[PDB]
């Protein structure tokens, strides 16, 4: 029967099927109730999920006329060995998605209790992740700022160092011109201004060196947040899928409309 059939998933959604068939090999299949109300066979081929309708007319089944098969099971089983290579060129129906392979916790109260625990652990981890993400984006933004300010310091330093070259160029002639004219006061004035300039360059060089240092430290903490993020992410998906399974079981076992 196509009720006892493992590959048959009844009232499942295309969105749900896509998850069930994501990153699977060709031949992977599952049957379901059409996105109406008449069944749909979904099959993985060339990285895609090909939807193949299961036509029915006067108790006869097939993909195209003539309708040769008597049941949906006889239809699946035939192509489970015979292969779809002949009907429109291309694989078989090799790897079924079993509705039985994945885990029935005895009682309604048992499932209810476990779901409550999962749902709780989920909200806990969710918050931990969103918090780590807040710091991930804040650190990433702050590093980027720092990187632009090192670029600005570099250009600042370039201007000031050119300023020394300008003093060196001009003053060399005038220091000679003042030593002869015996004007030592003005020589001391040229020297005081150059000293003034290089002391500033030293402050600007240390302002950058301090910023380059905060940047090494922040690039380091960015690397840790990322490391941490890459560990929470997979657990959080699994923990969310486990929860979502207990929520579905609860619905399936209970009174339905």
């Amino acid at each position: 029967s196509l009720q006892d059939a493992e590959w048959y998933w009844g009232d499942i959604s295309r969105e749900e099927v896509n998850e069930k068939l994501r990153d699977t090999a060709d031949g992977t299949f599952l049957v379901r109730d059409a996105s109406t109300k008449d069944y749909t066979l979904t099959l993985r081929k060339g990285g895609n999920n090909k939807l193949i309708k299961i036509f029915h007319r006067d108790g006869k089944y097939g993909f195209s006329d003539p309708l040769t098969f008597s049941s949906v099971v006889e239809l699946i089983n035939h192509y489970r060995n015979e292969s779809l290579a002949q009907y429109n060129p291309d694989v078989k129906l090799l790897y079924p998605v079993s509705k039985y392979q994945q885990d029935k916790e005895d009682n309604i109260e048992a499932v209810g209790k476990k779901l409550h625990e999962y749902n709780t652990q989920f909200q806990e981890k969710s918050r931990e992740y969103d918090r780590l993400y807040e710091e991930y984006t804040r650190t990433s933004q702050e590093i980027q700022m720092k990187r632009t300010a090192i670029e600005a310091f570099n250009e600042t330093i370039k201007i000031f160092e050119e300023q020394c070259q300008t003093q060196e160029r001009y003053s060399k002639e005038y220091i000679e011109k003042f030593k002869r004219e015996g004007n030592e006061k003005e020589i001391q004035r040229i020297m005081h201004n150059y000293d003034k300039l290089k002391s500033r360059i030293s402050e600007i060089i240390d302002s950058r060196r301090r910023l380059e240092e905060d940047l090494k430290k922040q690039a380091a903490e960015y690397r840790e947040i990322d490391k941490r993020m890459n560990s929470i992410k997979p657990d959080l998906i699994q923990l969310r899928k486990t929860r979502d399974q207990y929520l579905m079981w609860l619905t399936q076992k209970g009174v339905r409309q």
């Binding site: 250009e155 890459n230 560990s231």
Partner: protein, 1000 residues
């Protein structure tokens, strides 16, 4: 790069009253000058050269007049300051220093490049440094669009220039909907032509009862005919001496459109308002219009085997990765998952490398793809990522992507990619769980402090190139019931996201030639093509070549992430070129800007089409500028958007100066809100406001924050900032309510005060999209004969979590009104006393049905007494739409389509005019009917809504990352169901929420 902070200096938000500035003289000397923070550079230069006499070698300095200042800005640029009338606090300096230099080079060019780089918020000179030939070719080649536009803007120089600056604010159809027509007395309107008559200011009202089909000059004619058969020639001449303008704003009726077709008129007919127009001379407008010129830039003035010949399968070599950021005491191995895609579809089964340890990321492995190289279609891409595999618990291994990147298998010049390649990988976009990111941008991460991956593309003893259209055309010729007519019509009408069976694909492909009768089927048929086959693609090209054009609303679908083929997208652009109105372009601009992200190359027909229109229409140009400006911070699009904005700013004419005024007003507001968020977060509202006004009272602040155009509406002028009516709200992220005077002469007839909320801290992109969809929903209804009047106030995102929200005047939240279940009906009873009570109730019921259908369909964030508000008017307004679609599915795995807006007892009482059995009244029957109509209307236009959502998947919006998020709209509209089933569905939804009442 863009400026790190909003401050007057690096690490200083605001400069103290006086500040020391290092002045680097050209004689080598350094002068420490005490400068007042708002001193213009003219003064600073003057006071510095005075002081320069005290220092040695003053003999070497030329006249102060021979120089200008240069300094390092926050953007790390060496900017030269030619506009010496600029103040010191407005320079954006990194440190307080100024270098004295004599101006060299092109003053004219240098100045424009400063103005462009300021509007962009990035120094233009950064694009000159980009080695990439595509980047350079794009800058040069795009200038033809810039030339095309400025040249067209000067034919009939006085008029054509005005048609650019003040375009006609017209609807797409002159044909009035029958419900609008019945508002007119015997098919004619009563307009009020106001005129300011020289010598004295005063007014005067020429109340006219004219036909609504009247062209503005016919309205101008009948205006004369009343104010004065012998002088019919006097009017036949002087009608070209005056133009019509809307009272209270800069909206002009320049083109020959029927009066009712103008949006200001069309609205006035509907809301039973009197259209107040102002008559002014053409001469008094064409004189204000300046001579905008396009100059060619510095950069513009400076300096084989076929693919179908290669007889081999595609292969790519993965050499190595630099590093990954992962704990070894958590993950087991790392590998490179790769895939060959055509949009979002793998062309072949994805190929992983071998599993290596994170400490040793070296593969030097050749990946083999089940794709014959001639079969590779033009838009073929390589999507790849570095994932972390760990199977510590159970048989199931947990794969987690660490970094991704995508490469176009063909360069911008149809060249197949060859040899070694270094690719800097991107971070995983939050919420993306999939191992590959095919919606992702192509190209290397510009930040080189990210994992680099070394790739090796095959060499074929020559340059491999994609075949010419003549070769592909040839191959296509080489490659070659009434129940079938019904099935084809059936497929063509189904939504863009519904299932196509392999049987329906084979059917559509086998009947490819008949399709041409029903052109609306092109997307379903395009999904029936095998893109991993050159034979079917070749045939497809010849069919699309001579494919009849489809409606723009249908053409847009061919521009999303599912249709990457250049011939497909080219067809799409041509439909829009021929049939897309400027109204519809302005309407769907968010999406049109957004889809530029999905385009393979910088230079394409879409970028050209949009840019052309932005330079042809100043309204389109204004939002085109802002939509791109608001994403400049996003390193995934900054270069594309920077280059496009650059070409826009060169050719937008005078509007650059106006745009700069808005940008500078915004940056001051960003600085002000940044102070209150950090430095003064732990402060009291009374002390926070004292700081707020003190800062706004400043000369520099007033100069920048007064007299500019509202970025929410460029037709809205923002005059003097009325500081007294400016308020920091006591709510979420403490927004700034700002009040401006409307400088318009007859501002009294529209609004004298323009209020705009300034939010810094929250992302508004999602709110912005919800109000656009709501605007689009109202039109669907208005044109279908429904007066379901909602109030979609303006919301614009102006940057990274920064934006503007139009303030809603005369509105109060339900909670505020409840200050008993009759309190609400009583509030509206007191606010609307007498005869006008019936109109307020009709308005509340109409806005209720609108917001009920609109909220339910979109799945908007749960409503409450703070989320909902009412205007004195009777008008209902919803505020805050931070969530939409199945936003609750990840937090709580409940598969439930919910009713966000459940009409409470208070709501039904108001609709029922104070009756007791509210759900039994004739007034509630009329309400349900409105909803059932509204719902079916949107469900009729479902494809339009699905495509609009589809066009946004690459945006980065939390609630819109996959087609499976769009599946929510497919449930609320029950597309898989029938019209009778969906209506029956909606009814049960409304019944379960309200607990009975919704009768069939």
């Amino acid at each position: 790069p863009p400026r790190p902070s909003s401050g007057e200096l690096w690490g200083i938000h605001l400069m103290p009253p006086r500040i020391l500035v290092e002045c680097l003289l050209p004689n080598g000397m350094i002068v420490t000058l005490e400068c007042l923070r708002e001193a213009t550079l003219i003064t600073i230069k003057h006071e510095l050269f005075k002081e320069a006499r005290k220092y040695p070698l003053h003999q070497l300095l030329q006249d102060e007049s021979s120089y200008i200042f240069v300094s390092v800005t926050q953007e790390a640029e060496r900017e030269e300051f030619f506009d010496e009338t600029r103040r010191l606090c407005d320079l954006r300096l990194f440190q307080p220093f100024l270098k004295v230099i004599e101006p060299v080079g092109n003053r004219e060019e240098k100045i424009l490049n400063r103005e462009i780089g300021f509007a962009i918020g990035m120094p233009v000179c950064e694009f000159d440094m980009v080695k990439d030939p595509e980047v350079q070719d794009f800058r040069r080649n795009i200038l033809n669009v810039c030339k095309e536009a400025v040249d067209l803007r000067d034919l009939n120089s006085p008029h054509s220039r005005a048609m650019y600056v003040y375009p006609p604010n017209v609807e797409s159809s002159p044909e009035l909907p029958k419900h609008i027509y019945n508002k007119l007395d015997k098919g004619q309107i009563i307009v009020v032509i106001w005129v300011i008559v020289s010598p004295n200011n005063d007014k005067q009202k020429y109340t006219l009862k004219i036909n609504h089909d009247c062209v503005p000059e016919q309205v101008i004619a009948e205006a004369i005919r009343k104010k004065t058969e012998q002088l019919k020639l006097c009017v036949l001449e002087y009608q070209g001496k005056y133009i019509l303008k809307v009272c209270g704003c800069d909206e002009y009726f320049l083109e020959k459109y029927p009066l009712s077709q103008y949006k200001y008129i069309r609205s006035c007919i509907m809301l039973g308002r009197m259209p107040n127009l102002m008559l002014m001379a053409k001469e008094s407008l064409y004189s204000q219009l300046p001579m905008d010129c396009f100059t060619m830039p510095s950069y513009s003035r400076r300096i084989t085997k076929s693919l179908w010949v290669i007889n081999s399968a595609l292969r790519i070599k993965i050499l190595c990765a630099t590093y990954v950021n992962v704990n070894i005491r958590d993950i087991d191995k790392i590998y490179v998952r790769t895939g060959i895609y055509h949009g979002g579809e793998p062309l072949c089964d994805n190929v992983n490398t071998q599993r290596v340890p994170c400490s040793n990321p070296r593969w030097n492995e050749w990946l083999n793809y089940d794709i014959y190289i001639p079969d590779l279609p033009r838009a073929a891409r390589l999507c790849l990522s570095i994932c972390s595999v760990k199977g510590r618990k159970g048989a199931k291994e947990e794969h987690c992507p660490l970094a991704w990147g995508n490469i176009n298998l063909f360069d911008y010049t149809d060249t197949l990619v060859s040899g070694k390649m270094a690719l800097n990988l991107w971070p995983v976009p939050h919420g993306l769980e999939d191992l590959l990111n095919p919606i992702g941008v192509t190209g290397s991460n510009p930040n080189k402090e990210t994992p680099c991956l070394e790739l090796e593309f095959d060499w074929f003893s020559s340059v491999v190139k994609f075949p010419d259209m003549s070769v592909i055309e040839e191959h296509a010729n080489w490659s070659v019931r009434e129940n079938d007519k019904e099935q084809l019509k059936a497929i063509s009408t189904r939504d863009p996201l519904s299932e196509i069976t392999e049987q329906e694909k084979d059917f559509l492909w086998s009947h490819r030639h008949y399709c041409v009768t029903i052109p609306e089927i092109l997307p379903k048929l395009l999904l029936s093509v095998k893109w991993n086959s050159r034979d079917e693609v070749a045939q497809m090209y010849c069919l699309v070549k001579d494919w009849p054009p489809i409606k723009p609303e249908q053409a847009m679908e061919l521009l999303d992430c599912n249709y990457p083929d250049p011939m497909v997208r080219g067809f799409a652009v041509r439909c829009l070129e021929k049939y897309l109105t400027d109204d519809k372009l302005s309407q769907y601009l968010i999406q049109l800007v957004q889809v530029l992200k999905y385009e393979q190359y910088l230079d394409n027909l879409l970028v050209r089409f949009l840019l052309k229109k932005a330079l042809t229409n100043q309204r389109i140009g204004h939002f085109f500028f802002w939509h791109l400006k608001s994403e400049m911070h996003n390193k995934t699009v900054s270069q594309r958007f920077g280059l496009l904005l650059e070409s826009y700013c060169r050719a937008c004419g005078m509007y650059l100066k106006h745009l700069n005024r808005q940008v500078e007003a915004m940056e001051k507001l960003i600085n002000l809100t940044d102070i209150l968020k950090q430095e003064k977060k732990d402060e009291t509202q009374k002390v926070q406001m004292k700081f707020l006004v003190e800062q706004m009272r400043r000369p520099d602040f007033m100069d920048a924050l007064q007299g500019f155009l509202s970025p929410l509406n460029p037709a809205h002028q923002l005059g003097n900032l009325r500081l007294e009516e400016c308020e920091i709200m006591s709510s979420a992220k403490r927004p700034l309510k700002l009040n401006w005077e409307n400088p318009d002469i007859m501002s009294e007839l529209l609004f004298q005060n323009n209020i705009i909320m300034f939010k810094n801290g929250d992302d508004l992109r999602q709110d912005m999209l919800t109000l656009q969809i709501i605007r689009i929903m109202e039109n669907i209804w208005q044109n279908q004969g429904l007066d379901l009047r909602m109030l979609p106030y303006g919301c614009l995102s102006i940057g990274d979590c920064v934006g503007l929200i139009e303030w809603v005047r005369n509105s109060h939240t339900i909670m505020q009104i409840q200050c008993n279940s009759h309190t609400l009906h009583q509030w509206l009873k007191d606010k609307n006393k007498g005869e006008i009570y019936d109109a307020a109730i009709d308005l509340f019921t109409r806005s209720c049905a609108g917001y009920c259908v609109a909220t339910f369909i979109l799945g908007i964030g749960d409503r409450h007494n703070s989320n909902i508000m009412v205007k004195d008017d009777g008008q209902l307004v919803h505020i805050d739409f931070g969530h939409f679609l199945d936003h609750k599915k990840k937090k709580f795995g409940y598969k439930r389509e919910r009713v966000p807006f459940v009409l409470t007892q208070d709501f039904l009482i108001v609709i029922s005019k104070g009756a007791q059995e509210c759900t039994k009244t004739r007034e509630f029957e009329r309400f349900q009917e409105m909803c059932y109509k509204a719902y079916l209307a949107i469900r009729q236009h479902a494809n339009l809504f699905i495509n609009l959502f589809s066009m946004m998947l690459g945006s980065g919006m939390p609630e819109l990352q996959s087609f499976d998020d769009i599946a929510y709209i497919r449930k609320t509209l029950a597309l898989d169901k029938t019209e009778q089933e969906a209506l029956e569905y909606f009814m049960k939804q409304m019944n379960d929420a309200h607990h009975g009442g919704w009768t069939t």
